[PDB]
């Protein structure tokens, strides 16, 4: 019995990176000699496409990290994450795709919150989207003070508020610019309605909101 | 994630059936086999093998993609390992022999022809139980030269053994002469029962 068998054998395959290379990966404007079976056995994409396997849009630097990942089991991630996910996506490396998801999760902050959430929607990272949605929900107050949430789009902010004072005082904070000073009427109108179901008019007018309130 | 090489090796195993860049004499994946066998690594296709059968080759070839062989009578599994230079395979074999003592004499002589601790662990069972060993079929079917080597190692039971070796006999004179100079109630006892 010896589970260290494959990890031993794979270390062997590793030094045959050079005679043994039966193909080339055509990325950027370069060719990379690869062992077509090993790459086939880990990338359902490369496999079905089975020489010159031309990859569409992946920095040669990332294929090396992904290629080393293939041989070691460890991926060098840190500014680069989304590069490695785009490739994990393209090549269908579920394994590696999960590590990137783990990594992305531990990065969730009050700035990489919305960002990480739009990004997770896009590559369809379900659980990652869940967590970032959640952080946003239970940390809105802080996010309110984020450049990601401020220079945001009015259509995005409308959905950000969607998810269940603290909010009414984030939409008004969303007016940095003569530019976003247009919906302020829509806010003061919503404010009245909410004040229907009180003490909210006062709790607001007790802050530098007055500045944006005055002009209107 | 120790679960890498093993999943990866699993998938590669599903190709054993487009990916075979070489034929073995006949059907394999060149890099894999060359990573597992230094011997095959140097022959670089048709890699012709010397002196192992197909059943045996198909055995090592499978250990390669699985991690473990189930073998269980070895004189050939090791015959091959030493040949293909599969080292850890021979180690798995050693573990299987090292603890198969009891087929206890031939082992010590098998481990020799193969330069195998296994030997050290064979001499130390024979070196001690030489008594019941004498009551074995191997030692009872042993050879002369093979005895001047065992008997002549680092004891009444010995002289008894050598006499307990004469089944029928032209070595007696050397035993008696020896016995005398050395100074056995077994032989004495055999006298009244023998012919």
Curated annotation (Swiss-Prot), chain A:
Location of the BTB domain: 21-78
Q: How is it modified after translation?
A: Ubiquitinated by E3 ubiquitin ligase complex formed by CUL3 and RBX1 and probably targeted for proteasome-independent degradation.
**Residue limits of the BACK domain?**
113-205
What GO terms fall under cellular component here?
Answer: Cul3-RING ubiquitin ligase complex; cytoplasm; cytoskeleton; cytosol
Is Cytoplasm among this UniProt entry's keywords?
A: yes
Sorted alphabetically, which keywords does the UniProt record give?
A: Cytoplasm, Cytoskeleton, Disease variant, Kelch repeat, Neurodegeneration, Neuropathy, Repeat, Ubl conjugation, Ubl conjugation pathway
GO molecular function of the protein, one example? Answer: ubiquitin-like ligase-substrate adaptor activity
Picking any one GO biological process from the record gives:
proteasome-mediated ubiquitin-dependent protein catabolic process
Tell me the superkingdom of the source. Eukaryota
User: Which residue ranges run through the membrane?
Assistant: none
What happens after mutating residue 81 to T?
A: Found in hereditary motor and sensory neuropathy; likely pathogenic
* Compartments reported by the entry: Cytoplasm; Cytoplasm, Cytoskeleton
Which tissues carry this protein? Expressed in brain, heart and muscle.
Q: How does it assemble?
A: Interacts with TBCB. Interacts with CUL3. Part of a complex that contains CUL3, RBX1 and GAN. Interacts (via BTB domain) with UBA1. Interacts (via Kelch domains) with MAP1B (via C-terminus) and MAP1S (via C-terminus).
Outline what the protein does.
Answer: Probable cytoskeletal component that directly or indirectly plays an important role in neurofilament architecture. May act as a substrate-specific adapter of an E3 ubiquitin-protein ligase complex which mediates the ubiquitination and subsequent proteasomal degradation of target proteins. Controls degradation of TBCB. Controls degradation of MAP1B and MAP1S, and is critical for neuronal maintenance and survival.
Q: Which disease is it linked to?
A: Giant axonal neuropathy 1, autosomal recessive: A severe autosomal recessive sensorimotor neuropathy affecting both the peripheral nerves and the central nervous system. Axonal loss and the presence of giant axonal swellings filled with neurofilaments on nerve biopsies are the hallmarks of this neurodegenerative disorder.
Q: What is this protein called?
A: Gigaxonin
**Organism of derivation:** Homo sapiens
Gene name of the record: GAN
Q: Which residues of the full protein are shown?
A: 8 to 247 of 597
């Amino acid at each position: 019995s010896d589970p260290q068998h494959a990890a031993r054998l794979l270390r062997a395959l590793s030094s045959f990176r050079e005679r043994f290379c039966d193909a080339h990966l055509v990325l950027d404007g370069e060719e990379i000699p690869v062992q077509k079976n090993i790459l086939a056995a880990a990338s359902p994409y490369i496999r079905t496409k089975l020489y010159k396997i031309e990859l569409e849009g992946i920095s040669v630097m990332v294929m090396r990290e992904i290629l080393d990942y293939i041989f070691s089991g460890q991926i060098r991630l840190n500014d680069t994450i989304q590069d490695v996910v785009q490739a994990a996506d393209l090549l269908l490396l579920t394994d590696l795709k999960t590590l990137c998801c783990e990594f992305l999760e531990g990065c969730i902050a009050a700035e990489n919150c919305i960002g990480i959430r739009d990004f997770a929607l896009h590559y369809c990272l379900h659980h990652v989207h869940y967590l970032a949605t959640e952080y946003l929900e239970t940390h809105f107050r802080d996010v309110s003070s984020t450049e990601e949430f401020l220079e945001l789009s009015p259509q995005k902010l409308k959905e950000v508020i969607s998810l269940e004072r603290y909010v009414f005082e984030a939409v008004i904070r969303w007016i940095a610019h003569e530019i976003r000073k247009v919906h302020m009427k829509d806010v003061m109108s919503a404010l009245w309605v909410s004040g229907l179901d009180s003490y909210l008019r006062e709790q607001m007018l007790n802050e530098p909101l007055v500045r944006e309130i005055v002009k209107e």
